[PDB]
Design a protein around this ligand. Structure first.
Ligand SMILES: Clc1cc(-c2ccncc2)c(-c2ccc3ccccc3c2)nn1
Ligand SMILES: Fc1ccc(-c2n[nH]cc2-c2ccncc2)cc1
Ligand SMILES: [Zn+2]
Length: 333
């Protein structure tokens, strides 16, 4: 076992191995807290996340397990992965804190306007990561700029997969459709790409209602083919009761942008999710001709999510998480 040292940073106790030095607070979301640090063993800059109250309830315990399982499975250059995972606890009985470690990323996409060349590379990387994620039957569901880490080199990694946000959400979701597919993520990517090209949020709704109205203004109210797939009687009334609007001409709305970028946007921002382009198909779009390499856009190993339907005690989830910490084997340097 390694030697741990303790310190207090921002009213948070940090107890980690000696190998990680010079902890410095980066930010504190609700998920947990993060510090940048230096890993003496590898000479690398890393980010260490300390989970907040990981076993405070069934919800939290299952969430802690879900995140650890998912992070241990993601091995892709465009998806945040695990360099290490540890606990100061020496037994299950004492186990109450979880620490996750990954490569330190200097910024996010919100912190940029961009050349068409930079938009191509950044969206390319997002899709390449999504292809991998989607291949494992995982859906991100909350893609947005702040979930995309980027370094000075413009290398990008997707954070918080399968774990206003409303601005990047697919319409089927705030219609409360409970059978949405993986292309909910493609809608988000389309919102992101548009914003990188124009420098403006595409659909800055103030609430769920307004958000839908901004969306239909651009892509038009639903056609009869899409109307037939809506079961909710409520949803139909609301939708059919709206002032029917036509799909706008994207070449006009995004006038000045690379026509190839416009073509892709049109394929991503389709109201009917069954017609949206997939990540794999998007990667082969002529817009990414300079980066697309079919032999270097890998898929993931099968991912076992059966635990999602289990109803267990906090201690059972806690125990399962303990097991995942112990069985962890770091990736080759
Ligand atoms: Cl908004 C945000 C940023 C980071 C982060 C910041 C800087 N560099 C890398 C990540 C992590 C974060 C920080 C540390 C992590 C460690 C292991 C697994 C995931 C992790 C996620 N979460 N959320
Ligand atoms: F106004 C809209 C906006 C989006 C949709 C939609 N797109 N893909 C799936 C749906 C959908 C929404 C609600 N119920 C079934 C299907 C349907 C109507
Ligand atoms: Zn480089």
């Amino acid at each position: 076992r390694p030697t741990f040292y303790r310190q207090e940073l921002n009213k948070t106790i940090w107890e980690v191995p000696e190998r990680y030095q010079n902890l410095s607070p980066v930010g504190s979301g609700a998920y947990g807290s993060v510090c940048a640090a230096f890993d003496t063993k590898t000479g690398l800059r890393v980010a260490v996340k300390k989970l907040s109250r990981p076993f405070q309830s069934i919800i939290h315990a299952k969430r802690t397990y879900r995140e650890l399982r998912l992070l241990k499975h993601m091995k892709h250059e465009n998806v945040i992965g695990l360099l290490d995972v540890f606990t100061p606890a020496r037994s299950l009985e004492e186990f109450n804190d979880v620490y996750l470690v990954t490569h330190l990323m200097g910024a996010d996409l919100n912190n940029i306007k961009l050349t068409d060349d930079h938009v191509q590379f950044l969206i390319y990387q997002i899709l390449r990561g999504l292809k991998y994620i989607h291949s494992a039957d995982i859906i991100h569901r909350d893609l947005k700029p702040s979930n995309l880490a980027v370094n000075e080199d413009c290398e990008l990694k997707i954070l918080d997969f399968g774990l206003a946000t409303r601005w990047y959400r697919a319409p089927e979701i705030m219609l409360n459709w409970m059978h949405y597919n993986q292309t909910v993520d493609i809608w988000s990517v389309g919102c992101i790409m548009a914003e990188l090209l124009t420098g403006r949020t595409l659909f800055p709704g103030t609430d769920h209602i307004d958000q839908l109205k901004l969306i239909l203004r651009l892509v038009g109210t639903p056609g009869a083919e899409l109307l037939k797939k809506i079961s909710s009687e409520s949803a139909r009334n609301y939708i059919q009761s709206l002032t029917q609007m036509p799909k706008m001409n994207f070449a006009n709305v995004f006038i000045g942008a690379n026509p190839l970028a416009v073509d892709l946007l049109e394929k991503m921002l389709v109201l009917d999710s069954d017609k949206r382009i997939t990540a794999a198909q998007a990667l082969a779009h002529a817009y990414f001709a300079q980066y697309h390499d079919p032999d270097d856009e890998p898929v993931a190993d099968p991912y076992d999510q059966s635990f999602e339907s289990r109803d267990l005690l906090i201690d059972e989830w806690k125990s399962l998480t303990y097991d995942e910490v112990i069985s962890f084997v770091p990736p080759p340097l």
